[PDB]
Structures are given as C-alpha cells and as structure tokens.
C-alpha cells in the first residue's frame, strides 16, 4: 500500500522534521534503556509516561 501510494505521488521519502522525543524529553530518553515510543494521532512519538516508567520492568 505504502509503495504504491508513494510511487504515484512522488513521496517515497518523507523527510522527518521533529525527533520522536521532545526537547524536554530528549535527555530522559537517553538515560532509560526501556523507554520506547508509543503511538498517537497516527504518529510515533515519545511521551513522559514511557520514560522511567515503573511498569517496564515486570
């Protein structure tokens, strides 16, 4: 699906503009080896509930 859409609309490569983390989260992700992106609004973004969460070590 993606390839067909792209090769038709010349958007195979979509340049990223903002990182998955936010500037206020760009460090706290770096220190947690378990904080990983969750998805919302059809976007894969880092949150705060994922950083140093108490449930990612069950």
């Amino acid at each position: 699906r993606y390839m067909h859409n792209a090769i038709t609309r010349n958007t195979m490569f979509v340049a990223k503009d903002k990182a998955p983390y936010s500037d206020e989260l760009e460090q706290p992700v770096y220190l947690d080896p378990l904080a990983r992106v969750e998805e919302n609004k059809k976007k894969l973004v880092f949150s705060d509930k994922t950083i140093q969460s108490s449930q990612s070590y069950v």
Binding site: R1, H4, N5, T8
Partner: protein, 679 residues
C-alpha cells in the same frame, strides 16, 4: 370605495380610490364603481353538476373543472407514475414531479404510461424546479413539442424559484398551456408574480402559496404575514388564482382558509382562498411508493401547532427537523438517527471553511464512520478483515463483493440502477485489465448484461483470477475507483468511499429515493433514511395506506357539508344546478356575457367589419350553459386522450355578409355566407 373629494387629479394607476369627479359621473347609472368585496365576490359556493354531483365552485375549481384540492408535486413522492394517475382518476388535479427524471425520454415514457391509464380527456400538470438549469434545459423544449403533439399536459408549475418576466413570456405564449402555477416564497416573489400576470392579463396564473410550515424544501417566511400585505394587490389581478398549502391535512383544518374567516385572528376582512394544495398529507396514501415502514414512521411522528413550528431549527419537533441542503437551503425532514447525524454533521463539519475541513474529518474519522455504518443510509464503504477499514486495505475480491452488497438487492435480483451496473462492470474491466499480462485474450466481460446476476458470475469469475482475492486494491485502481464513483451522468453512489473535501458531495447528493425503496438500505432500517415531511401537517396523518381518492373526497365532503350548513341552511335544493362545470364564468366575473344575446329562434346577419372575433364567439355562445355554448366556447377538443385546438374556435371567424341561425332553443346552429352573390 374611497372618494378623495378634495382633489381633482385623477386617477391613480390602479384605481384604488375615487376622486372628486366620481361623484359626478352622470351616465344614466354606470357611475357606481363598486369596491372589491372579497367576502362577497369570491366566496366559496356550491354548484350541482347535471349528474347530481356537488362541486365547490371557486375561482380555481372553475378553472380546472374539478374540486379545489390539488396535489403539490414533490420529487420523491409525486414522481411515481402510479400515485399521480390513480388520483387524477379520483378527479383531483396533480402536477407531475419533474424533478425525479433526469432524461427527456424517461419523462416522456412516464407521461405516456399516465395518458394510457387516466380517464380519456383528463389533463395533468408538470412540476419543474427552476434552479436546475439542466432540467429546464431539456424539459421546456420537451414540453414544447409534446404540447405540439397535444399530450394532455395542462399545466407547468415552476417550483423552487420564480422565473424572470421575459422567460415567463415564453412559458406562457409559445407552449400551449391552460394554466401556469407558481410557488412564491417571498413577498418580493409575489411582486414578481403580479408583474407577470399584468403582462398577460388573460392567461390564468395559479399562485401556490406555501409558508414555512411545509415539508421538503423549506422557506423561512411566515405563512400569513406575506399574504396579509398582498391579498389586496393580488385580487386586483383577475387572472391570478391563489392557492395556499403548506400544512393542510383535514377538511375543517383548511375550511377557514377557503372561507377566509382565518383573517379574524388578525382583525382583517375575511380573505377567502381559491384553492388548497396538499404536500405531505398524501405520502401515507396506499397508492404511494413510500416504504411501508416509512409510512408507519410518518403516522408515528406527532404534529406541531403552527405557533411553534419555528422551533424546528433546533430540536425534533414532533419528530421533524430542518437542515441545510447541499447549498444551505433548509429542507424539512423527518427526524431519524440518520437525519440527526445529518444535522450534527452540517452543524460541526460542513459549516467550516475549506481549509480546516480535512483536519476536522481527520480528528473525527472513526466517530463519523461509526454512525455512517450505524445510522446513515450511505454507509462507509471500506469493510475488510471483519473490521471497518479504509479502502486501500481491501482485496479486490472483497471490494467487488462489497460493491455487490451495496449496489444489488439480492431479494429482487435487480440493480439499483443499470448505470451502477455499468460502473461495476467498468470496474471489473479494470480488475481483469490489471491481473492479466500481455494476453490480447478474451475478456470474461463481453456484455455488461451478464451482470444482471453478479452474485454467481463474479464468484465464478474470481477463479480465473485467484490472487485478486488476496492482493489488496492498488492505489491506481483505487483512485480510478473513486473517479468512477463520481463520473457525471451517473446516479450517485449509494455509499461513501472516502473522507475528503468532497465529503458532502458523496454524503448528501441523491438522498431522496431511499424512502421509496428501503430494501436498498443496508439493514432496511428507516432510521437511515431521509424522509421529507411537513411539521404542522403531521397532526392529521393518522391513518396509513388510505386511498389517495378517499383523502381528498373525505375532505371535500367535509367542506360540502360545512358549506351546506352555513351558506345554504342545510338545504341542498338551494344549490344552483349547472349542466357542466367549467369554462364559462357562471358568476358574473369581469367577462363579456352582457354582449352575449341568448335566444330560441335567432338569426343575426354579419358583415366583415362588425364585430371582432371573441365577442362574436360569445354572441354565438349564448348566456346559459348548453352543449352548443360549450362546443362554441370550449378551448379544447379531446381526440382520444389528446387535447387539440377547438375547430369552431376559428372557423366561425366573423366574415362579410354572413349570417348564423340558432333556432329552436339551440337545437341547431346554422352558419351562412355569400358565394358568387348567393348565400
């Protein structure tokens, strides 16, 4: 009559009042220019036909020779060729819903089925919609040569807009109609109508007044206040026949409007109405193609008094709300889950400008799709892997199966439209075009007529193309699908395939016919359906599937009984009796019956100069109503359900040295003329 005895500068252009001199006109008695007395002049009266039938002689009934109770011409209901015919035979007049036909040939066929089924000689009208320049592109030229062939189309009502004056000239003079109907909604539209009538003081014009309390399309203006300013300046145009509708369902419901005693609520003279048309009252008739569940729903929805019809813009008022059209014109519709969803959508998404529309749809996508599959009639198309989904995540086979399920009624083994059949076929043409490679071979689809039972054809077809059951729809075959779904000249798609700026373009267009066939509804739940109806009229729609003839007869009889009790003292013998009803004015309207000389054994010579034509015809007619007076005065001669011009209406043109002989109480007319000196 008002006489401005102070000043002598006569006269006002419309002769509203007299001046100083009108005291002095000393011609033997002719001075007494009386004032229009609406309560006396055009009061509803009774008249017995020679067959013993009793009619309500009005200015309108007198025009149509039948009861003063006509049927509007709604596009969904009135387009069915059965309801309109089965009520013409009931004796009441109907205008055919021209809106429901997109092709001249289809309308011509429907007309021909009408003519074959109505009584020989009856005539019908055609309701057109002025804001469809395509429909007036081919309808008007059709009416021209059709009337030229002489089909019994006796009227053309131009609803949803009043034409300009010079185009009304064409509407009147060229196409040989008997009466022209107009549906004004604004006081300025009424001014335009009067500007029209004064241009052709002899061609009758039926003014159909509909307030805002009506059904279907909708008008903002109140029902009374417009006419309460124009009743006077209308009645000063003798050609305009005024008919009020928009929410009438019972005999006593409308009786004050016929009598005119309705103005008492406003401390005004009684202002009688000529005729009364009907809208939503008839949709529950047996002879209507309204879905049984839809009729049941209509009977369910309670009415709303006129004092509180304006609250329809907010809440379900007895189960009826208005809502903006594709173009923002209000449209009174019954209140179903689908209709509530319609209103909510118009309220939040469609009111927005173009820009944020995409985003609003994006943040509301799943919620929209929820009710579009739950409450609306054009459901969300994509449905794959047991989940609602987008289009581009469906295999070809399941795409085709969904198209079948949403465009072919398995119960009646028919297509919603053959043009949809052709769309489906044109899509399979692309499927096979795709999944084949350098073949130059025969297509499994040679004739789209194979598709008249797709259920098995496609099923066996996907064997020659197995992987189309598993490869998803490609995009170039998806955008093509959409481009099909909105090709011109095709019936609009019965579902919604996407969420884009054209959302309403798929959501609202052609949202009317489904009330006729709820079997095309995904679950045949009327709550998906868009049914048009009038708020105030609903408080009378209590019986379902009653014959269309009975309704109008049930109310005409109530009117007759009331008018007998009131203006004839409960004695029917006092009712005047005429042989036939129509054509000549029996009440002395401003028509030349005084120069009509009636007699038993009469001869009167004539020369080339005296007289002109019309009054000569009248002289020949005689005052009273006899077959000869009819035949000499009738405008129309029926030739086996045709309406061709009257032969005598020109062959008896005044001529030099001629003479006519009407002797032995009109038992024979005998016209003479001079030949070679002999007569």
């Amino acid at each position: 009559r008002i006489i401005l005895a102070g000043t002598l500068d006569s006269n006002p252009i419309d002769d509203e009042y007299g001046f100083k001199h009108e005291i002095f006109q000393t011609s033997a008695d002719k001075a007494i220019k009386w004032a229009p007395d609406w309560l006396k002049e055009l009061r509803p009266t009774l008249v017995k036909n020679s067959e013993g039938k009793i009619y309500v002689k009005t200015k309108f009934s007198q025009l149509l020779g039948r009861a003063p109770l006509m049927v509007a011409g709604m596009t969904p209901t009135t387009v069915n060729t059965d309801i309109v015919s089965a009520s013409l035979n009931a004796g009441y007049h109907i205008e055919l819903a021209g809106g429901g036909y997109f092709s001249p040939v289809m309308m011509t066929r429907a007309i021909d089925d009408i003519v074959s089924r109505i009584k020989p000689g009856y005539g019908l009208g055609i309701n057109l919609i002025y804001v469809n320049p395509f429909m007036l592109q081919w309808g008007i030229p059709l009416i021209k040569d059709l009337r030229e062939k002489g089909y019994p189309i006796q009227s053309l009502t131009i609803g949803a807009g009043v034409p300009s004056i010079e185009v009304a000239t064409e509407y009147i003079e060229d196409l040989g109609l008997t009466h022209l109907g107009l549906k004004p909604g604004s006081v300025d539209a009424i001014s335009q109508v009067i500007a029209i009538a004064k241009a052709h003081p002899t061609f009758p014009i039926v003014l159909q007044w509909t307030g805002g309390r009506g059904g279907g399309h909708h008008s903002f203006e109140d029902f009374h206040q417009p006419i309460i300013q124009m009743y006077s300046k209308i009645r000063r145009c003798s050609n305009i026949v005024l008919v009020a509708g928009s929410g009438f369902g019972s005999d006593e419901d409308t009786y004050p409007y016929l009598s005119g005693y309705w103005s008492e609520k406003f401390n005004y003279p009684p202002m009688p109405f000529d005729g009364v048309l009907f809208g939503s009252r008839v949709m529950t008739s047996k002879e209507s193609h309204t879905s049984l569940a839809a009729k049941k729903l209509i009977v369910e929805c309670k009415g709303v008094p006129d004092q509180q019809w304006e609250q329809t813009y907010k809440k379900p008022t007895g189960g009826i709300i208005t809502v903006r059209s594709e173009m923002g014109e209000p449209i009174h519709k019954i209140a179903t889950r689908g209709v509530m969803f319609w209103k909510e959508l118009d309220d939040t998404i469609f009111n927005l400008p173009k820009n944020k529309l995409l985003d609003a749809l994006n943040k509301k996508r799943d919620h929209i799709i929820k009710k579009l599959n739950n409450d609306f009639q054009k459901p969300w198309f994509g449905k794959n892997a047991n989940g609602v989904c987008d289009l581009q995540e469906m295999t070809y086979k399941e795409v085709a199966n969904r198209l079948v399920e949403l465009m072919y009624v398995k119960k009646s083994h028919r297509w919603i439209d053959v043009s949809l059949r052709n769309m489906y076929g044109d899509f399979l043409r692309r499927v096979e075009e795709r999944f084949t490679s350098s073949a130059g071979t025969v297509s499994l689809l040679q004739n789209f007529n194979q598709l008249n039972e797709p259920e098995q054809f496609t099923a066996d077809f996907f064997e020659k193309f197995p992987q189309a059951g598993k490869q998803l729809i490609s995009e170039e075959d998806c955008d093509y699908f959409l481009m099909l779904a909105a090709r011109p000249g095709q019936k609009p798609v019965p579902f919604v395939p996407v969420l884009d700026e054209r959302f309403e373009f798929f959501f609202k267009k052609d949202s009317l016919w489904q009330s006729e066939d709820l079997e095309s509804v995904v679950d045949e739940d009327v709550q998906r359906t868009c049914i048009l109806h009038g708020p105030v009229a609903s408080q009378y729609t209590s019986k379902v599937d009653e014959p269309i003839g009975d309704i109008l007869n049930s109310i005409h009889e109530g009117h007759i009984a009331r008018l007998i009790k009131e203006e004839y003292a409960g004695d029917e013998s006092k009712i005047p009796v005429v042989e036939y009803f129509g054509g000549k004015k029996p009440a002395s309207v401003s028509a030349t019956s005084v120069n009509i000389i009636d007699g038993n054994q009469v001869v009167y010579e004539i020369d080339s100069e005296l007289p002109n034509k019309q009054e000569w015809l009248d002289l020949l007619a005689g005052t009273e109503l006899n077959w000869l007076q009819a035949f000499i005065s009738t405008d129309r001669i029926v030739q086996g359900s045709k309406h061709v011009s009257n032969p005598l209406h020109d062959i008896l043109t005044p001529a030099k040295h001629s003479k006519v002989t009407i002797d032995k109480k009109t038992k024979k007319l005998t016209a003479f003329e001079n030949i070679k000196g002999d007569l």
